[PDB]
Design an enzyme around this catalytic site. Sequence first.
Site, PDB file in Angstrom:
ATOM      1  N   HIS A  14      -3.534  -9.797  -1.865  1.00  0.00           N
ATOM      2  CA  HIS A  14      -3.308  -9.384  -0.557  1.00  0.00           C
ATOM      3  C   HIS A  14      -5.076  -9.089   0.144  1.00  0.00           C
ATOM      4  CE1 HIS A  14       0.698  -7.443  -0.566  1.00  0.00           C
ATOM      5  NE2 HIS A  14       0.525  -7.776  -1.880  1.00  0.00           N
ATOM      6  N   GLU A  43      -6.556  -6.517  -3.285  1.00  0.00           N
ATOM      7  CA  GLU A  43      -7.352  -6.496  -2.173  1.00  0.00           C
ATOM      8  C   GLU A  43      -8.522  -7.186  -1.757  1.00  0.00           C
ATOM      9  OE1 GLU A  43      -5.464  -5.849   0.687  1.00  0.00           O
ATOM     10  OE2 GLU A  43      -3.653  -4.691   0.024  1.00  0.00           O
ATOM     11  N   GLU A 102      -2.764 -12.217   6.188  1.00  0.00           N
ATOM     12  CA  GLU A 102      -3.826 -12.196   5.166  1.00  0.00           C
ATOM     13  C   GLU A 102      -4.154 -13.659   4.600  1.00  0.00           C
ATOM     14  OE1 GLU A 102      -2.204  -9.200   2.591  1.00  0.00           O
ATOM     15  OE2 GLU A 102      -1.736  -7.880   4.029  1.00  0.00           O
ATOM     16  N   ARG A 121       2.408  -9.755  10.671  1.00  0.00           N
ATOM     17  CA  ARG A 121       2.350  -9.374   9.226  1.00  0.00           C
ATOM     18  C   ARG A 121       3.622  -9.771   8.294  1.00  0.00           C
ATOM     19  NH1 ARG A 121       0.510  -5.107   5.788  1.00  0.00           N
ATOM     20  NH2 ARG A 121       2.052  -3.856   4.732  1.00  0.00           N
ATOM     21  N   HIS A 148       2.161 -11.027   3.342  1.00  0.00           N
ATOM     22  CA  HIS A 148       2.025 -10.770   4.741  1.00  0.00           C
ATOM     23  C   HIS A 148       1.071 -11.961   5.252  1.00  0.00           C
ATOM     24  CE1 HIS A 148       1.832  -6.363   2.826  1.00  0.00           C
ATOM     25  NE2 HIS A 148       3.105  -6.567   3.708  1.00  0.00           N
TER      26      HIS A 148
END
Lengths: 35, 299
Positions: free
Chosen positions: B186, B261, B65, B117, B62
Amino acid sequence: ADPICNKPCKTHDDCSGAWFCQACWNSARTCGPYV
Amino acid sequence: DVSTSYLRHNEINEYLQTLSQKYPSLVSVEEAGTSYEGRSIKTITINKKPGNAVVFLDAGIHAREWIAPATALYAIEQLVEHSSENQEVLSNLTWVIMPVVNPDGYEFSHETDRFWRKTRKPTGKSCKGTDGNRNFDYHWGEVGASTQACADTFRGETAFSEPETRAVRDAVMKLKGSCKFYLSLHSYGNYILYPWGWTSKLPETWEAIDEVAQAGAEAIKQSTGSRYTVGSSTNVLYAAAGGSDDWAFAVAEVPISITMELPGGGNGGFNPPPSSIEKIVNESWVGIKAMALKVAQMF
Ligand SMILES: [Zn+2]
């Protein structure tokens, strides 16, 4: 710029009309962006 | 060095090639595929030894990020330029690291739209981009993926429609059997997640993946004190059918498949200031190394 961000939510419909924070995070229970 | 600024995609590739020049007996830099717009999607293989367990790490699927490729680059720097301090994860472990999965979007985020994204391949007029983490061929197009080309979670025209995800597919498939740990970086949210992304039901071997995730969260808690929530992606974050971790776990048969994440920062979460890079990547690498060490200790 997105007032729906950090709005409390139970499902994704509670984050409708957000354009940035369209996702309802399950653990946080608040509207956030797709990560 | 690599944690002082957000590197552009070209700078990331030159850094990888420089490491190939400087440490030829330890690393090998290879091209896993070509992006839609023609950018070389590169990987670096660290400590290639026959019979080793393989850890596959990717980041930047993405575009916005930015801290995910930064963490992946920091992991490369620690393993390659400081290998003497990471021998525990450099004995029976072989690393294949793809710092940027989606260079077209990543470069677009640097130049045109900071919060882009998806990829940059046109979707059949009026909108560009496919969510790479909804483009993998396992329960593809199901809950958490959108059929609308303009949505953030557009599944794509077909499964594996994006060359970026095909590059990930081919690289992992080439390591089938040897790849024991798939890690996808991510941002943001401070989560360590695992399948499934298409249902709230847990996989049969969820405890084994959970133990690896617990080790990463525990190591970060011991080091910096930051909290990482551990659980299945659907139950902890949201339904994300078509993700790379589900595909690697089920199709590539990677036993330990995890989506991480990384910490958020800045006004948009995806944009920590460059001054915050060093602390975030240092903390993230502590968890990442711990999970890899837990994987290595299984044998
Ligand atoms: Zn992401």
